[PDB]
Amino acid sequence: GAMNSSNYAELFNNDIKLFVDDTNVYRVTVHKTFEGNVATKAINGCIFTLNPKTGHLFLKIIHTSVWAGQKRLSQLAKWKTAEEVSALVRSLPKEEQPKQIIVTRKAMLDPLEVHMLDFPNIAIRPTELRLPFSAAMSIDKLSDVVMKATEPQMVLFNIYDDWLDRISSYTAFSRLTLLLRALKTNEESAKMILLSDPTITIKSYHLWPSFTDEQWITIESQMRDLILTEYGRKYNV
Amino acid sequence: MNTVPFTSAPIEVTIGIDQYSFNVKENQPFHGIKDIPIGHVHVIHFQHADNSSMRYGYWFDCRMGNFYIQYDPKDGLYKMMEERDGAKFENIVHNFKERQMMVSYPKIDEDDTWYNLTEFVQMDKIRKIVRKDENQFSYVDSSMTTVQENELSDPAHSLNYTVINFKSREAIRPGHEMEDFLDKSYYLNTVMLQGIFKNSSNYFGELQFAFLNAMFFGNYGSSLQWHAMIELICSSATVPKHMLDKLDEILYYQIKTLPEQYSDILLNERVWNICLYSSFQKNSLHNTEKIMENKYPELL
Ligand SMILES: CCNC(=O)CN(CC)Cc1ccc(Cl)nc1
Known part of the structure; x- marks a missing residue:
């Protein structure tokens, strides 16, 4: 079904x-x-x-x-x-x-x-x-x-x-969808957050920066905050 | 004029002959039906006063023999049987008419309704859908399932209608996927008309039989079949003009003959809105569309 x-x-x-x-x-x-x-x-x-x-x-x-x-x-x-x-x-x-x-x-x-x-x-x-x-x-x-x-x-x-060398499929998929949800709701903000820190490289063969676990947690939080906020900016809450 | 005599009427029953029906009381003296127009198939059918479940009935052609009804207190139903002794038969019938214990097929002579509902229906074809070849007449009832229903249980008792399925290989030519599914003219004209039915008349005859089984017995699977044979045509962009014009007449009379109160179960909204308003043939069924809108505009 x-x-x-x-x-x-x-x-x-x-x-x-x-x-x-x-x-x-x-x-x-x-x-x-x-x-x-x-x-x-x-x-x-x-x-x-x-x-x-x-x-x-x-x-x-x-x-x-x-x-x-x-x-x-x-x-x-x-x-x-x-x-x-x-x-x-x-x-x-x-x-x-x-x-x-x-x-x-x-x-x-x-x-x-x-x-x-x-x-x-x-x-x-x-x-x-x-x-x-x-x-x-x-x-x-x-x-x-x-x-x-x-x-x-x-x-x-x-x-x-x-x-998938470090996290599970479930966890890899939740991250991907959070990233893509961020991107859809406010692309410019989404992108800013990904490229803020110049030391972190988007290696040519990668879509996504080579974050550490700890940096992924911070990134993931910042995307959450973005997704939450664009919802307010759109419904005023 | 042909006669279908009844041995007796032991149980209270509603008896139908074609689109006509009358109430018979338990042990009311009733010995059959006279003046039945030769030249068409007919159906004689039954609904017991006690169990309105199971409508059942018998398709027959008086040209193929002498048929009579006899109640069977073992199986509990009115059974059609053949008399082969032609003189035993005329004699029984004559006696019953003299005592005037027969009702008269009540045909109005301006009325072509039954002709128009059965134009293309032939007992030879019925007999291939309802397989039971020791008999020249064919039993149907409310609960019989179709061969296609049994695909997705007892086969001796199936309706072997022609299997139509729009999402199947038969219907879809490799490489014309998009075209053959949005325009079924290949499937109608080549696969079905040229291939299986051979001519529009046999197709139309199955069409017609399905509808009548649906209407008289509420056979759910027959309604599906009806609706499917309509859809195939309405979903085809290339139909012989002679088919479109007869189809308009076929459906017109089916809609006309339907009970005003049964249009909720026996008519599939999706199919009819497609035929009449969306499909290629939205402009080609003027009679059918006029009587649907004046009689059943709720559905649309
Ligand atoms: C769609 C069918 N394959 C998949 O879903 C993913 N694959 C499992 C069969 C792993 C894979 C396949 C092909 C290549 Cl080039 N790289 C990896």
């Missing part, structure tokens, strides 16, 4: 599963035409497919050329997401194939279900969590590869860097 607060811990059991998010697949800037009308110009996007235990993020890059000559792009984008998720599952052998795909938006269910008639042992599920994966493009490293790409391309990342 649906994935919610209650069956939270299942995402960290032995089963190797993926989360698919499609909110950054179809991206447009909206501008004005000479005649005074409004037109959209597409820019590159990605599917955000992630193993929440290891953190491996199969970033599929969606080149604006895939939209060319096509109608009803918001609807196509979800069928495109489903074709690309399907192709990924089709490259991996049976043992290597994941056990459950959880789509972060309910509109993806039928698209994927249809593009997975070929794999009957992989359950497609929705979730009732408001997961912040759309803030994925606030991660500089990931934004840059998407914007620079010249062709369809798949890139491999581990979104937890080396965190």
Whole structure:
């Protein structure tokens, strides 16, 4: 069934599963035409497919050329997401194939279900969590590869860097979602907090600074305070 | 004019013949139904006064033999049976008419309702959906499940309707995933019409039978089937014009004949709003849409 607060811990059991998010697949800037009308110009996007235990993020890059000559792009984008998720599952052998795909938006269910008639042992599920994966493009490293790409391309990342040498999957995932929640609510503040201390390096092969445990605790607190505050600034409390 | 004689009426029962029905009292002298129009399939059906659970009934075609009803106090129901002795049969029937113990199929001659509800329904096809081949007539009741229901228990007693499933390989061609699912014309015209049913008439006949089983017995799975055969058409962008125009007439008469009070369970909102307002055929069912809006506008 649906994935919610209650069956939270299942995402960290032995089963190797993926989360698919499609909110950054179809991206447009909206501008004005000479005649005074409004037109959209597409820019590159990605599917955000992630193993929440290891953190491996199969970033599929969606080149604006895939939209060319096509109608009803918001609807196509979800069928495109489903074709690309399907192709990924089709490259991996049976043992290597994941056990459950959880789509972060309910509109993806039928698209994927249809593009997975070929794999009957992989359950497609929705979730009732408001997961912040759309803030994925606030991660500089990931934004840059998407914007620079010249062709369809798949890139491999581990979104937890080396965190799993020291903390658990559960703990790695709570940190990631706190970071992404911060980023979504007020990106500038979120980013300030991450780069404040110049001594801490964002090594080229990392999205996230190489904090110590103690620095992660301080960082994590500061993100909490941010998330709390933007809620007040928005509802006045 | 054909006759369906009844041996007797031991138990209080509501007897139906096609869309007509009358109350028969326990041991009321009642010996069957005369003036039944030859040339169409019919259904004769029953609902006991004591147990309104289990509506049940028998599809038959008087051209295929002489059929009569006899109550069975062992199994507790009115049973359709065939008489092969043609002279034993005429004699029984004649005697019962002379004593005038038969009610008269009460057909108004301006009324084409039953014709229009059964236009495409043929006993040969019924007999493949309801398998019991020692008999020329076909039993149905409220509780029988479909072959597709039993997929997701007793098969001798299943409704073997044609399996339709929009999220399946049969329905979706590899490489046309998005196209075949938002526009089912491939599935309707090639898979089903050209492939399984062969012509629109057989399809329409299953369509029609499903609806009637739904209406007369409240057979839940038949309603599902009905709604599914409609959806496939309304969800197809390319339908022969001859199919659309007949479909409009088929549904018009189904909506007309439905009890005003049963439209809550037997009509699936999602399917009808799609057919009438969202689907490709929103503009192509003028009669069906006019009578739905004037009779059941709540649902929309
Ligand atoms: C989606 C299927 N694989 C996963 O979920 C994560 N993998 C487990 C099978 C670990 C992995 C896989 C591939 C590469 Cl290049 N690096 C690591």
